[PDB]
Each structure stands twice: as structure tokens, then as C-alpha cells.
């Protein structure tokens, strides 16, 4: 599923992501935008280390979900990576909440640093009613 901007914003709010571990909604929105274009089926294979990024938040198979083919990986979210490719983002949101409970928080995603940190991210939720 390819979410529309405001549709996603309202979904993420109901799922309790606004202010989760100190992270504003707009920041989550900026992260989904740059990681997958708001696409829940996006996947990106990292030939360099043999892991794959899955879903709307591009969650990595080395630590977060199990895909069986990543060497030396763990599955902190206790999910199959297939779960992160569903049109319903419930499991993807629960896993993203897990990723940010670790020290780095949202900084775990480099694209957030490049494209969202220290920027005016208000545009991502503007006019959406959240």
C-alpha cells in the first residue's frame, strides 16, 4: 500500500506514535517519507552486508526481524520480516517502537539524520488534522 500523506499521519497518531520515546509525529512522518515514500511493500537489499530493509520504515533484517537469510542476525521485534510488508502497519509500528527504545532512538536511521534532523519538519503533518 502507498499511503497518502495525511492518511498516514492520522494512522500513526492512532497507533500512539506522537511523542513516543520523545519523538514527534512529524519526525516519524519525515522518516517514512525518506525511507520508503510511504510504501509498505518497499524492500531494499544491502548487497554489502547481506541484510534487507523492509517496509514503510525500512527496518533492517540484521537486528529487527527474521528473514532467515541474513547471517548472524537477531530478531529483536520477534517477527517474521514478512510482517513488515503488510498493508496494515500495526506490526511495523510496534517494531519501530522497539527500535527507538534502544540508545540511539530515531538516530538509528541514517536517513533521519540526513533529511530530517534539525530541519523544519512541520510540512509533513501540515493540514492533516493531527
Curated annotation (Swiss-Prot):
Protein known as: Lysozyme C
One GO MF term: identical protein binding
Subcellular location: Secreted
InterPro entries linked: Glyco_hydro_22, Glyco_hydro_22_CS, Glyco_hydro_22_lys, Lysozyme-like_dom_sf
PANTHER family (alphabetical): LYSOZYME C
Domain spans labelled C-type lysozyme: 1-130
Organism: Homo sapiens (Human)
Location (main, coarse): secreted
EC number: 3.2.1.17
Disulfide bonds: 6-128, 30-116, 65-81, 77-95
Disease: Amyloidosis, hereditary systemic 5: A form of hereditary systemic amyloidosis, a disorder characterized by amyloid deposition in multiple tissues resulting in a wide clinical spectrum. AMYLD5 primarily affects the viscera, and the predominant clinical features are renal dysfunction of varying severity, and intra-abdominal bleeding. Inheritance is autosomal dominant.
Entry keyword annotation includes Hydrolase: yes
Keywords: Amyloid, Amyloidosis, Antimicrobial, Bacteriolytic enzyme, Disease variant, Disulfide bond, Glycosidase, Hydrolase, Secreted, Signal
CDD domains: LYZ_C
Active site annotation, chain numbering: 35, 53
Protein function: Lysozymes have primarily a bacteriolytic function; those in tissues and body fluids are associated with the monocyte-macrophage system and enhance the activity of immunoagents.
Enzyme class: hydrolase
Record-linked Pfam families: Lys
